[PDB]
Amino acid sequence: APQVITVSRFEVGKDKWAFNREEVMLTCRPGNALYVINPSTLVQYPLNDIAQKEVASGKTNAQPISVIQIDDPNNPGEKMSLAPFIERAEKLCV
């Protein structure tokens, strides 16, 4: 079954943490579709392009990642980068 893990701002650090909550869940589905999962509501948000097309497909019920992705205080007008989390989830792939 897809591996799901919990990551925390404590582990990643405030400087790179990219979400409006202190813990989120990461997974990698068959096809290398990466998603972030909300631990209280279980809603999924696409992390990479493959996942965005699964959503766009109608195959996966999910919301835009911008719903929980926070702005970058060091890059005004832009969102905090997902690359630290994409690199963590890509390692759950199989």
Curated annotation (Swiss-Prot):
Disulphide bond pairs: none
Sorted alphabetically, the Gene Ontology cellular component annotations on this record are: outer membrane-bounded periplasmic space
Keyword set includes Iron-sulfur: no
Biological processes, Gene Ontology terms: copper ion homeostasis
Q: Does the keyword Signal apply?
A: yes
Q: Keywords in alphabetical order, please.
A: Signal
Name this protein carries in UniProt: Uncharacterized protein YebY
UniProt organism field? Escherichia coli (strain K12)
Report which gene this protein is encoded by: yebY
Q: What fragment of the full-length protein is this?
A: 21 to 113 of 113
